[PDB]
Design a protein around this nucleic acid. Structure first.
Lengths: 110, 129, 173, 242, 124, 143, 93
RNA sequence: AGUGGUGGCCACUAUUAUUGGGCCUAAAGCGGCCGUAGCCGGGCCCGUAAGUCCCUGGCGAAAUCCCACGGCUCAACCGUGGG
RNA sequence: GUGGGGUAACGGCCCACCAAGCCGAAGAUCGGUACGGGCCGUGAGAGCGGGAGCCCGGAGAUGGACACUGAGACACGGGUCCA
């Protein structure tokens, strides 16, 4: 148990990677969002989706937009599709990976 | 397929009025509808009203007093803050304070003038004058 | 960034009603251009614009701006000291036309004619508050109304300038 | 395109803390890097020309600075681009005049005159603490100055405490601590040029600093950030504060 | 040049047109390719902002370390295995993480000759 | 039925609908696709300089009868050939073969034809850098 | 006539700074020599050390603003006050 | 001391229409039906606070804009102060 | 993804290997068009249209391409080739 600074319990598994914020050298600084896993096929990778409503100044109605974000999935938690997860800005890691999972708020089966 | 109780209710009221009957029986009765019916009755636009347990959805019985020029339901529930009511009031009223607007606010659905006095915005639901 | 004209052209240049009304007005006050009348109407209209925005305005800034408006209106000599916002709408163009410097100086008897007052103003023969003004379109505050006086160096300042005799006879005549 | 470091600063872009007419001319003094930030400082040249009216033309002002007649924090400075920042003491011995730099309620800086006896004390916020080789403790202040002290004296200081610094000889006089109920003068924000007392410290995670709540003299409560809170006394201000 | 910059392709795939020329602050430098020899040959390199960095083009000695923490300066005979590439071990190339054979025996390199200019390793 | 959609969460398709029908008009589509700027013989220029070749007279469309004088000109800018109407009385007398001229649009409805002359889109204003109207008045002299 | 609105003392520069107003009703704006030789009287100043910078003649006014220096030594004005105004006052050819 | 001619842009225009347009006879409902995403959806009880709303800190830099005051003769412009 | 390289610096920026991903009908890909903002013109306003003139940020030195000096450069008034 090492502190990440975010109010969430730590993953039970202790992995040996250098890229687990709970079990590695990397840090966290920047926003925290929440979202859902939509795809997990690439290794140690996750595409988090986020829906939200946007306002049209000329039409005074709402546009529901879907936003995706790539992020890294450490093995300790092993995020899968259908799961509500918490995401934090992180050091640049790949061509596009710039966010990391910190926890799984609620898995798919629930 | 019936989809909005309130709009059918207020339309039914106006369509009774332009004839000018005495008693109206709003078949789609709901708690929010009853709150609304209280609102303008507190400015006596209607006489008494009563709830009738029909076993299915309730029915509201209402007397008219012949004082409703037009009573429409703002359907797209525009949310509005306090400071700009005059634009929306001008959107749905003939003259300065010539009638009311019904706003759903954090405390409970009721009229707009007090909502300015209490200084709380909300979501427009109906207008009438 | 470009500076805008200070006046608003009429939406139609040949309405008989408005044309003849303006004609009567500039006959009364002997202005040089309808542009001038339009400018005066413009500031009239902007006073009213402020009044109308404020009359429906709620908020501390609104009240402060309202008091500023009332105070400036009073200071111009266009309203009574007990004036209230409601009356400002009733302000007419003629209320401002009277407050024109040229109309004031003619109304002081110091001129036989409106255009003679104009000639004096351009020629500087008039002074206000110890400073000379050459513009007959300037709007005079109430507080200065008592100080409107002949410019010292002006030949008209002396009580012997032959035109001033005719001025005095017109005043008494 | 631009290719590195600037050397100019157009008047129109100048910081909002400077009582400088902006459309009279186009070119101003770019401050060189120094103790205080761009947002909380002004060149001394403008202090001489505007805020004191001693010099009408910048050349003459520079001449007077060349004479070295000016004592900021008990040090003469000839640099007519010196950032003279917040809570500095400007002293003119030729005139026996002493002011302290302090912001306005609006967010602009003024020279509040102070007594001569106060002119030697300068309170410095403790920005951060660090360990340097030899196990020595170095404290970095809000104004960028640095003070070295022993390992034993490390706990005498903590970040966000105020040290009354004796600028003429660099001697530490007193350490006002940050605890509930101190007297604090605000530095930046909407609550600028406010002075009050502390009731609560809001521990904010997720990248957001400590929001202290300040209770004014009249009892009104407001909030500001930790870094904007500058302690000046345990219960009353130890310096003349408008 | 050696340009360590934008990928010409978007993540989705749409090819990206360039809109400006490359920048000297953005270019890289050649590979060191540290090799086994009888003497240490090194090149100092002026770098971005006036810094310096020394680079081993030929290496003769290594600092091996015991798990206890005691270090031995020794010679380097040959490289056993280079996980970074298969061509490197064949050509006595020296890189961090490589398995090397010295007089003491098997060591794993825990330092980068390219940037450090010395080679440190752990006895296995 | 009721005009649709109007709901809280339907703004997107309402916007799409209006963008689709924004193609229904003519002026907006003409502006966005810049049809004139690829059909324009004047290349957006209010006035253009040309060289005249030939004098041509035409008959007013019926019931209006009258012989209108005009000229055909090749544009110095690009080289297209276009006819410009000569307004005034005795105008053609001043103009002759091989004359430098300056020409603008006729100011018809949408810039089109005017009144009793067919298709003519332009009128001369200056000939050899001397303005037509004063020569029509005769105050000045052609070079 | 001349009426002084203000006299202040630049002690860092050892000089007196004088703001004043000149009353000239109906008569042209005065020459520099006369205003200098007449202001020199009523503050007990040396002519050489005193310099007048600007006499602003107002439009449509019989009052002209005036603003002038008064140093304490010959060397300081040469060192500080730039040559042009010395030429205007004649203190340098 | 400007006015006229031409060209392009907003209003005129509810001839672009959410406020705020029509589709039997004036151009405009497809021949009919099924249904995916999308959009809109009966009432009552418990929870939530994502939206929605009220209060509160930082921030959205200047110049331009509105207002009072001061300087330039007034104005425009500039400064001080409030939005 | 693994392991390295070079960089001021993290990273497919590169390289060796291991996998089959990732984007697209809430329109990729491709083309047409075009520096972005503070703003400005018009309108009672909803809105419509535009980014020339000042300030901020971005990009360029006929086109391309490549170095040295250097804290800072591929450097309008420094250098090399090609057209």
């Amino acid at each position: 148990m090492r502190d990440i600074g975010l109010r969430v319990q730590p993953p039970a598994e202790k992995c040996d990677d250098p890229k687990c914020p709970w079990h590695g050298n990397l840090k966290i600084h920047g926003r925290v969002f929440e979202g859902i896993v939509v795809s997990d096929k690439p290794r140690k990778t996750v595409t988090v989706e986020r829906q939200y409503y946007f306002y049209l100044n000329k039409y005074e109605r709402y546009e529901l937009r879907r936003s995706k974000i790539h992020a890294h999935n450490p093995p300790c938690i092993n995020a899968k599709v259908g799961d509500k997860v918490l995401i934090a800005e992180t050091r640049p890691l790949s061509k596009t990976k710039h966010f990391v999972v910190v926890a799984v708020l609620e898995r798919a089966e629930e | 397929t019936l989809l909005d109780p309130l709009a059918n209710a207020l339309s039914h009221i106006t369509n009774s009025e332009r004839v000018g009957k005495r008693e109206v029986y709003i078949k789609p009765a709901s708690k929010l509808i009853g709150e609304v019916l209280r609102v303008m009755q507190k400015y006596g636009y209607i006489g008494e009203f009563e709830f009738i347990d029909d076993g299915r959805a309730g029915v509201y019985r209402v007397q008219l007093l012949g004082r409703i020029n037009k009573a429409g339901a703002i359907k797209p529930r525009f949310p509005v803050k306090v400071s700009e009511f005059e634009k929306w009031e001008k959107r749905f009223l003939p003259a300065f304070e010539f009638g009311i607007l019904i706003v759903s606010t954090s405390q409970g659905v009721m009229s707009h003038k007090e909502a300015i006095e209490k200084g709380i915005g909300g979501r427009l639901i109906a207008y009438v004058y | 960034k470009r500076q805008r004209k200070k006046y608003e052209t009429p939406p139609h240049p040949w309405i008989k009603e408005r044309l003849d009304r303006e004609r009567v007005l500039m006959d009364k006050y002997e202005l040089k251009n309808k542009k001038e009348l339009w400018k005066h109407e413009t500031q009239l209209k902007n006073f009213r614009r402020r009044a109308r925005r404020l009359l429906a305005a709620r908020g501390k800034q609104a009240e402060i701006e309202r008091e500023q408006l009332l105070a400036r209106l009073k200071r111009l000599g266009l309203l009574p000291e007990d004036a209230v916002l409601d009356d400002v709408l009733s302000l007419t163009i003629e209320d401002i036309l009277e407050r024109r410097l040229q109309t004031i100086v003619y109304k002081k008897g110091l001129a036989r004619t409106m255009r003679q007052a104009r000639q004096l103003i351009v020629h500087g023969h008039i002074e206000v508050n110890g400073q000379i003004i050459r513009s007959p379109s300037y709007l005079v505050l109430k507080e200065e109304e008592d100080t409107i006086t002949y410019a010292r160096t002006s030949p008209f300042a002396n009580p012997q300038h032959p035109e001033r005799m005719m001025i005095e006879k017109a005043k008494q005549g | 395109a631009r290719k590195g470091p600037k050397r100019h600063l157009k008047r129109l872009a100048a910081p909002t803390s400077w009582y400088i007419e902006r459309k009279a001319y186009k070119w101003a003094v770019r401050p060189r890097p120094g103790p205080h930030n761009m947002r909380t400082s002004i060149p001394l040249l403008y202090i001489v020309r505007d805020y004191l009216g001693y010099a009408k033309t910048a050349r003459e002002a520079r001449k007077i600075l060349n004479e070295g007649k000016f004592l900021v924090d008990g040090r003469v400075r000839k640099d007519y681009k010196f950032p003279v920042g917040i809570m500095d003491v400007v002293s003119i011995p030729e005139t026996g005049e002493h002011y302290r730099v302090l912001p306005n309620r609006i967010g602009k800086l003024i020279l509040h005159p102070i007594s001569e006896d106060e002119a030697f004390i300068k309170p410095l916020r403790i920005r951060n603490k660090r360990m340097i080789k030899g196990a020595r403790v170095q404290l970095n202040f809000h104004d960028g100055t640095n003070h070295i002290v022993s390992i034993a004296e490390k706990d005498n200081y903590f970040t966000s405490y105020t040290v009354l610094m004796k600028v003429p000889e660099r001697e530490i006089l007193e350490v006002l601590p940050f605890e509930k109920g101190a007297y604090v003068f605000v530095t930046q924000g909407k609550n600028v040029a406010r002075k009050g007392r502390i009731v609560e410290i809001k521990r904010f995670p997720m990248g957001w600093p400590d929001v202290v709540t300040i209770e004014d003299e009249e009892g009104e409560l407001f909030d500001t950030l930790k870094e904007y809170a500058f302690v000046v006394g345990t219960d009353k201000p130890k310096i003349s504060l408008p | 040049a050696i340009w360590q910059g934008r990928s010409l392709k978007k993540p989705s795939g749409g090819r990206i047109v360039l809109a400006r020329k490359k920048r000297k602050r953005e270019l890289g430098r050649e590979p060191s390719n540290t090799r086994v020899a009888e003497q240490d040959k090194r090149k100092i390199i002026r770098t971005y902002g006036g810094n310096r960095k020394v680079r081993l083009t030929a290496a003769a000695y290594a600092n091996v370390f015991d798990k206890s923490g005691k270090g031995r300066k020794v010679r380097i005979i040959r490289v056993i295995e280079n996980p970074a590439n298969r061509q490197f071990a064949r050509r006595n190339i020296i890189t961090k993480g490589a398995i090397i054979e010295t007089e003491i025996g098997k060591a794993k390199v825990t330092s980068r000759p390219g940037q450090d200019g010395v080679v440190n390793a752990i006895l296995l | 039925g009721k005009k649709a959609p109007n709901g809280e969460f339907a703004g997107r398709k309402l916007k799409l609908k209006r963008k689709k029908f924004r193609w229904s008009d003519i002026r907006y589509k003409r502006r966005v696709l810049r049809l004139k700027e690829k059909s324009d013989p004047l290349e957006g220029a209010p006035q253009a300089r040309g060289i005249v070749l030939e004098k041509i007279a035409v008959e007013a469309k019926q019931p209006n009868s009258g012989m209108r004088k005009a000229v055909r000109v090749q544009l110095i800018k690009n080289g297209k050939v276009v006819t410009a109407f000569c307004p005034g009385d005795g105008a053609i007398k001043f103009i002759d073969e091989h004359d430098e001229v300056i020409i603008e649009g006729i100011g018809g409805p949408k810039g089109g034809s005017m009144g009793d002359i067919p298709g003519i889109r332009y009128k001369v204003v200056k000939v050899n850098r001397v303005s037509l109207k004063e020569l029509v008045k005769g105050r000045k002299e052609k070079p | 006539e001349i009426r002084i609105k203000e006299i202040k003392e630049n002690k860092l520069i050892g000089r007196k700074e004088i703001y004043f107003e000149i009353y000239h009703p109906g008569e042209p704006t005065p020459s520099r020599k006369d205003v200098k030789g007449k202001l020199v009287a009523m503050l007990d100043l040396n002519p050489e050390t005193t310099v007048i910078q600007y006499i602003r003649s107002y439009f449509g006014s019989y009052i002209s603003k005036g603003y002038a220096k008064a140093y304490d030594s010959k060397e300081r004005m040469l060192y500080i006050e730039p040559e042009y105004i010395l030429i205007r006052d004649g203190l340098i050819e």
